[PDB]
């Protein structure tokens, strides 16, 4: 290690900071000490009798948690799908070609409480299950994560998909309408239900019960916003995953990308457990969280913003990262992308243009590099005393100056404060 | 022309490109210097090699490192 | 005139049009360049050919690639 001494009297000082471990947990590590996904659902104590329990519990608030699990179970466990191709994930194969399979093929276990203190039951209940009633319960995980003025925007269509079947019925109230759904996300069995449903119909899309994915689709990749940022950055720049990574100019971002891309996580696999790594309890610390990739979040999102992103505006500004360096890297990358458009003929009728030999000339090279090669741009930047030019400053100023209604502690709020003054 | 290195201000150098399909960079001494006010300010002395006066003379156009990886400069 | 290639300023090249009914482009070195400061900054010296200086000469109005596909250049 490095030795530090004080100059005035030649004494040794050892700079110390409080330990900060807290490492990320990969989906593949779960399958080296376990081979099943435990789903503790209490034995179905009378099928039709449960439909009255939750019908009133959601009607006038305070519903039983374990009763919701069993009702969804005893209704969805009869949906069967014909396995076209073989299926495997992380070691355990859940079937093969020709076989029939159900939603709850993940390993079901039985809870030991039975019935929670008598929840208010209801007598008047006909065949409303399998139609619209179980679909409504799954879609309350979606509303249980949004607290902004968008909860009366997603629950809007929630009382439209249930009307497709038979009747138009609304359960939760106005004041304490959202104070009962955020509890559900804490119950690990409920998260395992909505994830298994979404995973099932992702395989069997042509089945008519796929419509259930209305309130289950938000689960797919819930804790993978860092991978979303990567995807978004590739689309907005138009360049490939490999070429984008070669534009990483900061060490902390490099660390995070290496962490994000660790081999053998089934990241690009079709039909896998990985997308639902928290909901299936495969991980308690997502390696694909934005919070665990703060530098890459900031850098990736700022660059996207400067390239006219609609999403990056209101993205969180992370704490405890080297803002000034990530800004320069982001400015240079965006300036490089922004200066050099694609621009090439795609179709022709008689004649077409080419220029694969003619690059410059010419000595009119008082201008930035031609393409998007990071090497040429780093060389060109080195010629500017590693300092952003009036041109880049202006470019970034144009990119932000129009922005309006920016929130505290967002990348939008940051960028404007930085480039427009 | 003064001084001792300003005599080679008319003849040009040819640098071989590093990329498979690219035009070779042709450069002369007076293309990177105005007269004497620019030549004395940067670091141009009387005693200089023709290559060293070109290489270290790459400042007026602001392209030393960019021409270093694009061409065999 | 100085340098060696500047003596070709008055005489002009004629470029054949690539399209049938189009008038040939007749261009000279005097039209493409200002006086001396413009010529001794772009890469034009005196060791060049007449064609090499004409092909480099497309810079004053910025018209190389436009004349490349329109004419037999």
Curated annotation (Swiss-Prot), chain A:
Q: Where does it live in the cell? A: Virion; Host cytoplasm
**Interaction with the phosphoprotein as annotated region, ranges:** 349-389
Entry protein name: Nucleoprotein
Q: How does it assemble?
A: Homomultimerizes to form the nucleocapsid. Binds to viral genomic RNA; this interaction contributes to the virion assembly. N in the nucleocapsid interacts (via C-terminus) with the P protein (via C-terminus); this interaction allows to package the L polymerase in the virion and positions the polymerase on the template, since P acts as a bridge between N and L. N(0) interacts with the P protein; this interaction prevents the uncontrolled aggregation of N(0). Interacts with the matrix protein (inner layer); this interaction contributes to the virion assembly. Interacts with the L polymerase.
Record key words, sorted: Capsid protein, Helical capsid protein, Host cytoplasm, Ribonucleoprotein, RNA-binding, Viral nucleoprotein, Virion
Gene3D superfamilies in the record, alphabetically?
Nucleoprotein, Rhabdovirus nucleocapsid protein like domain
Q: What does this protein do?
A: Encapsidates the genome in a ratio of one N per nine ribonucleotides, protecting it from nucleases. The encapsidated genomic RNA is termed the NC and serves as template for transcription and replication. The nucleocapsid is bullet-shaped with the tip containing 8 turns of a conical spiral before reaching the helical cylindrical trunk. Nucleocapsid assembly is concomitant with replication, therefore viral replication depends on the intracellular concentration of free N, termed N(0). All replicative products are resistant to nucleases.
Entry-linked Pfam families = Rhabdo_ncap
Task: Enumerate the GO terms in the molecular function aspect.
Answer: RNA binding
What the entry lists under InterPro entries is as follows: Rhabdo_ncapsid, Rhabdovirus_ncapsid_C, Rhabdovirus_ncapsid_N, Rhabdovirus_nucleoprotein-like
A single GO CC term for this protein reads:
viral nucleocapsid
The answer to whether the entry has keyword Repeat is no
Query: Family, per the entry?
Result: Belongs to the vesiculovirus nucleocapsid protein family.
Which residues does RNA bind?
142, 151, 205, 213, 285, 316, 407
The opening ranks of the lineage are: Viruses, Riboviria, Orthornavirae, Negarnaviricota, Haploviricotina
SUPFAM superfamilies (alphabetical): Rhabdovirus nucleoprotein-like (SSF140809)
Instruction: Tell me which domain of life the UniProt entry assigns to the organism this sequence originates from.
Output: Viruses
Swiss-Prot record, chains B, C:
Q: Reproduce the UniProt comment on modification after translation.
A: Phosphorylated in the N-terminus by host CK2. Phosphorylation of the phosphoprotein is required for the transcriptional function of the P-L complex.
The Swiss-Prot or TrEMBL note on domains reads: The N-terminus is disordered and is involved in binding N(0). The region of interaction with the L polymerase is necessary for transcription. The hinge region is highly variable. The central domain is involved in oligomerization. The C-terminus is basic and essential for binding the N-RNA template.
Give the start-end ranges of region Interaction with the Nucleoprotein-RNA and template-binding.
Answer: 53-73
What phylogenetic lineage does the species belong to? Viruses, Riboviria, Orthornavirae, Negarnaviricota, Haploviricotina
Localization, UniProt: Virion; Host cytoplasm
How does it associate, per the subunit comment? Homodimer. Interacts with the L polymerase; the association of P and L forms the polymerase complex and positions P optimally for encapsidation of newly synthesized genomes with the nucleoprotein. Interacts (via N-terminus) with N(0). Interacts (via C-terminus) with N in ribonucleocapsid (via C-terminus); this interaction allows to package the L polymerase in the virion and positions the polymerase on the template, since P acts as a bridge between N and L.
The family annotation for this protein states: Belongs to the vesiculovirus protein P family.
Chain positions with Phosphoserine modification: 34-35, 41
User: What's the protein called, per UniProt?
Assistant: Phosphoprotein
Q: What does this protein do?
A: Nonenzymatic cofactor regulating the function and conformation of the RNA polymerase and part of the transcription and replication complex. Binds the viral ribonucleocapsid and positions the L polymerase on the template. Acts as a chaperone for newly synthesized free N protein, so-called N(0). Plays a role in virion assembly.
